[PDB]
Amino acid sequence: NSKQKVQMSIHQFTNICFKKCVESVNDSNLSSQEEQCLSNCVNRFLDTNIRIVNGLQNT
Amino acid sequence: SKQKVQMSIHQFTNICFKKCVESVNDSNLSSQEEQCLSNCVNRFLDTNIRIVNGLQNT
Amino acid sequence: SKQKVQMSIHQFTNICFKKCVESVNDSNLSSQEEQCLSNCVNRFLDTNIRIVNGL
Amino acid sequence: ATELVNKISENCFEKCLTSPYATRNDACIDQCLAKYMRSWNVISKAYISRIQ
Amino acid sequence: ATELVNKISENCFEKCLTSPYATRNDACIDQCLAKYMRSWNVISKAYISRIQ
Amino acid sequence: ATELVNKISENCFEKCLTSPYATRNDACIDQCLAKYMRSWNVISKAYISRIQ
């Protein structure tokens, strides 16, 4: 791996996904719903990257 | 400035794509969205000049 | 200091201008949108401190 | 050339997927990619025709 | 164009122009520029007055 | 390192404060910070489990 880059991406993903999944701050606890949205969001984002990069070669 | 062509085109594309493409249903640009896309770039460039002129005017 | 001040002012301006300047139809800032503008900067700085202390 | 990848990803993520992001939707991404590259071409054309 | 120039352009583009972007609107941009520089002044003033 | 601080600030600024930016909503910021760091943990976990 690369310790430095491992952090890098996590910051960016967190920044994108937090906006999209944390709709409001009323308690300090993450709900069931917003925790799963958060991990789906990251995965779905990675899936997109691969789809895009694969697609940029073939085509 | 063979690199600065890419760098701007990337950025304009990013701004204009958001503003002119209201949905992805086919892999094609319609006429309306194609003209919006070129207007958007031109209008943007016009703005830059107006701003920079205005900054040295002031 | 010299450069770093400008860079913050640029970004604060960029954030706050969006949030406070709703519709342009003259070149004057009103009394209201002027106070929103200065509040916005202060409130932003307060937030930074709260966050960094908290971290 | 590689940051590009991230911007398309963002743009296409916003238009093809929604909270809670359960269902993967690759038909929409492919289209969105295609649509994106066509947009790029039009903008670069418009842009260059302006630098005389 | 410098970092500042581009951000004003973006801000004023958003507030003075709408799709399909056929019709230019220079009067609005000039105002928006003026209004932008006044905003800058107010923010820098507020900012410096808070450096202790 | 410090870049993080600014992004949390932006995110929490957007969710806790709305123009006219009159009053300090500190209770909300604290929560938002707490909620932000929990989000970070979940993403890093999801992320690392992917790269296996």
Q: Where are the domains of chain E?
A: 1-52
Q: Chain E: nearest CA to B3, how far in angstroms?
A: 15
Nearest to residue E32, comparing CAs of B56, C10, C33, C23? C23
* Contact state of B43 with E6 under an 8 Å Cβ cutoff: no
* Residues D7/B6, Cβ–Cβ less than 8 Å: no
CA angle at residue A15 from A14 to A20, to 5 degrees?
Answer: 90
Domains and CATH numbers, chain C: 1-55 (1.10.287.810)
Q: What's the distance, CA C52 to chain centroid?
A: 19
Start-end of H helices in chain C:
2-20, 31-54
Domain F1-52 has what CATH class?
mainly alpha
A30–F7 C-beta distance less than 8 A: no
- Alpha carbon distance B58, F1 (integer Å): 40
CA pair distance E26, E30, nearest whole angstrom: 6
> How many residues appear in chain A?
59
CA distance F52 to F48: 6
Interface size between A and F, measured as CB pairs under 8 A = 67
Q: Is the dihedral of CA F33, F36, F38, F44 positive or negative?
A: negative
User: Cβ contacts of residue C19 below 8 Å, gap of 6+?
Assistant: C36, C40, F19, F21
Amino acid letter, B18:
K
Q: How far is CA C39 from CA F8, F11, F31, in A?
A: 19, 18, 22
- Closest to B10 (Cα-Cα) out of C53, D36, A37: D36
- Whether the CB-CB separation of C37 and C29 falls below 8 Å is answered with yes
Instruction: Round to the nearest angstrom and report the end-to-end CA distance of chain D.
Output: 25
On chain C, the residues whose CB falls within 8 A of the CB of E13 are none
Identify the H or E element spanning F39: helix F26-50
D48 to chain A, minimum CA–CA distance in Å? 23
Tally of CB atoms within 10 A around F43: 26
Closest CA to A52 of D9, B9, B23, D40: D9
Angstrom distance (rounded) from CA F7 to CA C4: 18
Q: Please name the member of C39, C51, C52 whose beta carbon is closest to the beta carbon of F21.
A: C39
Q: How far apart are CA C45 and CA D7, in angstroms?
A: 30
The answer, yes or no, to whether E and F have at least 3 beta-carbon pairs within 8 Å is: no
φ, ψ of residue F24 in degrees (nearest 5): -75, 120
Contact C43/F22 with Cβ under 8 angstroms? no
H or E segment to which residue C1 belongs: none
Resolution of this deposited model, Å: 2.6
Q: Angle at Cα B28 formed by Cα B23 and Cα B31, nearest 5°?
A: 85
Q: Calculate how close chain C gets to E22, using CA atoms only, in Å.
A: 20
Cα gap D23→D16, rounded to integer Å? 10
Cα distances (Å, whole numbers) of residue F21 to D21, F10, F25: 33, 14, 10
The answer to whether the CB atoms of B48 and E33 lie below 8 A apart is: no
- Counting Cα atoms < 13 Å in the Cβ hemisphere of D12 gives 32
Distance CA C37, CA C29 (A): 10
Partner C contacted by E38 (CB < 8 A):
yes
Tokens representing residue E44 in the block: 């820098």
Q: Which amino acid is at D39?
A: S
